[PDB]
Symmetry: C5
Subunit: 312 residues, 5 copies
């Protein structure tokens, strides 16, 4: 109803704390996730002080109305959180303990430069706006920050959930505001990617390469082109789940490299057939024997160079 | 309006019970499901006692306001439940009878190690938070727990719906809480999977294997590569549904084994043609004669070993 | 405000009636549909009887509040209905007339044993709970049950919309309840399935069979395997719509039969080539000539037997 | 608060009008579209009359409450419209002006007998129910019916938006009601369907037909079968957008014709090879030469006949 | 709740300014996007002026009630905005400062004529409605127009965010109306489209063109038709992330030209074989060696013509 008047000019400090209960629905393309947690607040209000002995009580309980509650808002949320007050209590000296449970949908960008083996950081921002009569700043209560042991994300491993103690103060629309940053660090579970994507791709590439041990043109054409079709199908399957980015990723580089290898293999088969038709089997044999060793070695070297370039 | 005052120090016991009406929309990828049921509560409040003869009635009826109702919440839910009050009744001694119908969406992890033939357990958690003046604990009323005869889940057989009668008491946010566990056990209906997935795969594999009775290189290449493409399409269709897990499952192992078999078949065809083109037909005949028996036997042994290793 | 007291022991009867306006969005996979209709209720209340001559009116109008209105609920709904009251009228003798318009989503199982040519029956259940002082039952008013001539479902034909007059009375949660059943009978529009699915599949099967008039092994292999791939694509397209069931259907049986036929055709082609290579070009000719007649006759007999089994 | 009393028996007249602002999301399969428009009403209430000279004003503004506003509903909507009141004004003689902005989702059937080149009419129905003391009818005010110049429908051309002047008075649920019809006429933009769907299909068909200038059986088999597979893929793509209908459309007829043509082409290739193997080259040459001319002419004639049938 | 006093004859001017916070969910299918931003207002009221020394205060803080605030809405929104008032303050003069936060779903047309390399402009329209007693106009405050540094859209770059100073005044529904225009210029990030789309397509086309260096008819048929199948599959891959619009875009022209080139290549191969089978090798050799040069040059010239036509 009315913010507590200051003594002389001191600001009002509000202690915050978030306790995660459930987190779920991490969408890569939409770059969002949903959360379910507690919100804890604590400040000072001398007007509500009382004598414990006179009143015969040690804790008083107030309804959300008929009491001043600061307005805390999340910055990067799609809609205002749906919340419900759990409990409000007042201490004899004037300290107020506030608790509520909410749910919200949070927007946060993701970095996909190492997509199969990447780690991400998700941010939650709290802000408060100063009133025309009092200045309000935020702080962090280290005891009230935490998460449940049952919190799970489908496909991710949760590492930590901390908060930066120092807030950021800035002027927005001729008023002063304070901001807090809560960080949740997660890592991707990449085990399922190996036997479901990587190994079949290598098998198909080897089946394509086995055409350097034959001399029949039609069989070579069939092998190479059909393996190319299989590669296109796998590429569609993989790309349906990876969002478009303005930079170069590991997976895209590997896929482009495989396309280039298929093109060069077709070129080699055509060259060998053309040489053999003109009655020059010696050059064709030399080229084929050279390619048999040239292709895997260059593939391995290029893969090693790419790994050093993206993880070094 | 105010919790009942204790006689001397005793905690308040609230008897609960859930009666299922509808359960539906089990999402394997999101690991969620939707529920629709009754919620029953009963506690003791001596402030509402009355004299039957003086009043002339047997049971009174109050509105949800101007009466104290304990705050019960679900832990693993996406949002607060949609509630409505059905009936409130008070006995002459003071016992209160409460009834309510709700609906919610519940989060619960799943285990996919035996995906076609797996059985799951779904959990619902009830919690109550103690007030600053009284201690509250939960209890189970066995005569109020059950389900309808028409409760059906598309694709699952429902086996039982019970509750663990021992609650868990702990501290959180400087208060004591009590939690209850309700367990629903289901089994997947695996009949449709056999003639839709398992047998076409075997027929395609046998069609691929029929290439050990031939000597034409082009026909063998066409057979094997076309069957491989069909296998890839089937694998994509299967994987569209099953999610990604940090552990190996039965279906993934089988699919990887089939990929390995196709690779070895291509190698065998290439080796046979290479040996024949060098005017060594006896060795090629010996190798293909061995392969005709070697492939199905090793396949059968591999599936027997995998089935023992995953289900025993 | 309070249920009307009885005379001695008579129960309270409520006359119901549902008039369909819009029914739409029948999902086969979820087995749900959406409805929009009118709900009519009528009962007796002697506490509201008035003298028409004194009042000067033939009918009195009341608000939804300030008058006791029984609570009627739908059993098989995902959420509570969204309703708005249209009018309330009271006759001088005390009979109360009620009206409202609602919209809800109804859960109802379906049977797919004859999927292309099946018929269904959708159920809507109405229930009422007895108050402690009065016992309430339900009755059907045949003069207020019907549907608009413009009620249309996409892909279905509507036959009738009736109600079962006899209510089912039982006990639930220490109270007596009455239940009514409204049945909507529909049939499927199967014309679009024939030229879109059935005929192309037969054409592809005949194209596959055309290989019994040829002796070129490579051409036969190409024909049979490519037609198998086309069959797989069509099967995936069909399977995207029909959900999984714990029993066998007509379409699944036909698809499995086609897979078996393709396998046998591949075996026959391989056998003919093998016998020709061994320099016995008479048994191969006999087998091919036999198969030319054997395949269509067996296909026709099997289709007749399956059609008799599923629709007889 | 109460319907105005008549002079002797005349019905109350309400004048309506709809001004379109937005129209979007026209779903072919669901047969729904979304709207955003102003709603205008005007009636007569003599009890609100005042003398402007004594009052000192020319227009009096009333809150939506404490005044009688007629209940107007939309018949073919999924849910009740979401609206807010804009302005209410009363003329000195008693005439009331009312304005409101709403949004709704409408249901309307569609016709697909000429799917690429079809024209549709969308209906919006307004209804009102008579009260027990007064009779209400609806009229049309042509000065308040129209649409914005920024109204755009993705894929359609908006032609006109009018209202049928004569309402439909009928008795429903023992009460007389009046209904109005608003019609919006749209036409489909078919240009993008030509180069994206139509011409590639012709190119693939001609590629299939080019096999009448060769005598190599394997090449002809490969050509025809692979082009059939490509046709199947397009057909799936095209079908994934057009809903199933209980009648026959133009596109389905063309697609079935293409399937028939592929079947007959395969038959011709088989016949030619069989005749050539039997040392009868003259008949095979004559048949191939005849087919070279026969196929395109019959295709063109069938297309002309179908176009005449579906557009004449 | 009183409109500000009109001093002689003058309209009321309101200074508006929108400060962006979040932008997300830009759907090209429905041409919609969600926004989250501030809204600043400022106008004048004679009565609210108060003496500073008499009160010993600088600025007051009025509730939404007991004060008059102009109603301002957005033309292009599916539903009304969800707003919560943040701060209302009054200077020592009659000037009032108003602030609020809102979220909305905006409808704005999109253009994809240059789809990969296109730029779009998003519009937000602010409108105030005049009352029967006072005229209202809208102004623009440049110090309140801004955009956060953390505003991001998935796959787009944000160029600028300004407003058009000049309103548009027009009469609608017998009332004078004023409008404002806020424009947000964006451009699409096209880097990822080169290695994902452009280069694989070129590789496939070159693989198809490699058939001008061979004589084997079967190999040429296999190459060209299988590359056509790969082209159709990659068309599916491209179309999976392209809005379904009735447009004549750059991509559609490219794909149609590719289809034409495939058709002409098939025609050339057929002509070469047909000439060769009649013992005219010189003409076939000449045609092949001419096509080797003709195809790429014509392809490049057509590409240049299309690029100059669409981007000129
Ligand atoms: C034989 C071929 C390879 C078979 C095994 C494939 C997987 C090998 C790696 C598994 C474990 C990697 C790991 O622990 O990663 C952790 C670690 C995380 O580092 P940061 O903390 O971000 O620094 O990751 C790495 O260092 C990754 C190093 C490079 C891994 C390369 C894995 C193989 C890549 C694909 C090669 C073949 C491509 C075939 C087609 C693929 C199409 C997508
Ligand atoms: C636009 C650019 C792409 C245009 C379409 C490219 C189609 C593929 C080209 C394949 C050419 C094969 C010709 C061939 O084998 O020639 C053999 C030729 C003749 O040798 P002699 O008999 O001594 O004379 O010898 C060779 O193999 C020379 C080397 C040719 C291959 C290396 C260059 C390939 C260039 C591809 C460019 C793609 C971009
Ligand atoms: C990286 C590794 C993979 C690289 C690409 C692999 C291509 C596929 C391998 C091709 C095998 C064909 C070899 C072949 O025909 O050799 C026959 C050869 C000829 O010997 P002589 O008669 O003395 O001459 O004899 C044989 O049969 C040898 C058997 C070799 C095949 C067994 C090993 C297969 C290799 C799999 C690698 C997996 C990684
Ligand atoms: C290869 C040759 C052509 C293959 C054609 C495949 C389709 C054949 C399907 C035949 C079929 O559906 O038969 C239906 C029908 C059986 O009666 P139902 O209607 O199924 O009985 C319902 C009541 N108990 O069969 C017939 O009588 C058809 C005529 C058979 C004799 C010729
Ligand atoms: C070889 C050369 C092939 C040339 C024809 C193919 C290119 C054009 C095909 C589409 C025709 C477009 C112009 C005609 C349509 C038109 O005028 O539209 C307006 C008008 C509005 O309709 P109503 O007023 O109700 O009558 O439309 C019509 O009148 C349509 C009349 C139908 C005749 C044209 C139909 C042609 C389409 C089929 C062509 C062959 C199909 C090939 C395979 C297609 C596979 C999906
Ligand atoms: C059940 C219906 C479908 C059954 C499966 C169909 C398989 C494909 C049939 C192909 C027939 C080819 C006949 C052939 O090559 O021989 C030509 C044969 C033999 O010539 P002579 O030595 O003079 O005797 O003579 C002919 O030209 C007969 C004409 C056959 C083609 C027309 C009928 C094809 C099938 C139509 C029925 C299905 C629709
Ligand atoms: C293979 C050879 C070429 C195949 C060409 C495919 C496309 C042909 C489509 C012809 C077509 O659509 O004709 C339309 C049209 C029918 O008249 P509509 O305006 O549709 O009907 C209104 C009167 N009741 O037919 C014609 O006029 C045919 C003109 C073409 C003749 C050459
Ligand atoms: C070999 C080609 C390899 C490079 C392909 C991409 C080249 C263009 C990259 C840079 C584009 C650029 O500068 O964009 C800015 C600029 C923006 O201009 P406005 O201000 O809107 O006028 O873009 C342009 O003007 C683009 C000009 C045309 C670019 C054409 C790029 C190549 C297109 C494909 C050609 C080959 C087709 C192969 C199949 C493709 C299937 C989709
Ligand atoms: C209606 C349009 C589509 C009709 C169906 C098209 C099927 C494919 C056509 C293939 C043509 C091949 C003809 C051929 O090889 O003839 C060679 C022919 C024989 O000449 P002589 O030795 O004097 O006899 O000589 C040539 O190469 C002439 C050039 C003809 C082919 C070029 C034009 C093809 C027309 C296609 C139009 C498509 C629109
Ligand atoms: Cl918030
Ligand atoms: Cl809850
Ligand atoms: Cl209900
Ligand atoms: Cl409505
Ligand atoms: Cl708004």
């Amino acid at each position: 109803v009315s913010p507590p008047p200051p003594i002389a000019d001191e600001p009002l400090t509000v202690n915050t704390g978030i306790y995660l209960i459930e987190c779920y629905s991490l969408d890569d393309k939409a770059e969002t996730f949903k959360v379910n947690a507690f919100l804890s607040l604590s400040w000072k209000d001398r007007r509500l002080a009382f004598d414990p002995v006179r009143s015969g009580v040690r804790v008083k309980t107030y309804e959300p109305e008929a009491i001043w509650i600061p307005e805390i808002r999340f910055v990067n949320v799609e809609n205002a959180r749906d919340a419900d007050v759990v409990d409000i209590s007042v201490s004899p000296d004037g300290t107020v303990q506030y608790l509520e449970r909410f749910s919200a949908r949070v927007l946060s960008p993701l970095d996909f430069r190492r997509y199969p083996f990447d780690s991400q950081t998700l941010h939650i921002y709290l802000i408060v706006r100063s009133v025309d009569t009092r200045n309000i700043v935020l702080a962090v209560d280290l005891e009230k920050v935490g998460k449940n042991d049952d919190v799970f994300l489908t496909g991710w491993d949760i590492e930590s959930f901390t908060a930066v103690v120092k807030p950021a103060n800035f002027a927005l629309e001729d008023r002063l505001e304070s901001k807090l940053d809560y960080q949740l660090r997660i890592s991707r579970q990449y085990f399922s990617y190996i036997p479901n994507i990587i190994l079949p791709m290598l098998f198909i590439l080897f089946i394509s390469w086995t055409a350097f041990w034959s001399t029949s043109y039609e069989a070579n054409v069939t092998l190479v082109v059909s393996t190319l079709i299989a590669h296109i199908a796998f590429n569609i399957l993989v790309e349906t789940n990876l969002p478009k980015t303005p930079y170069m990723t590991y997976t895209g580089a590997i896929i482009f490299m495989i396309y280039l290898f298929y093109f060069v293999a077709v070129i080699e088969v055509t060259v060998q057939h053309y040489l053999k038709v003109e009655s020059q089997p010696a050059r064709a044999a030399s080229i084929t024997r050279a390619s048999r060793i040239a292709f895997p070695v260059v593939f391995l070297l290029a893969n090693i160079i790419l790994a050093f370039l993206f993880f070094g």
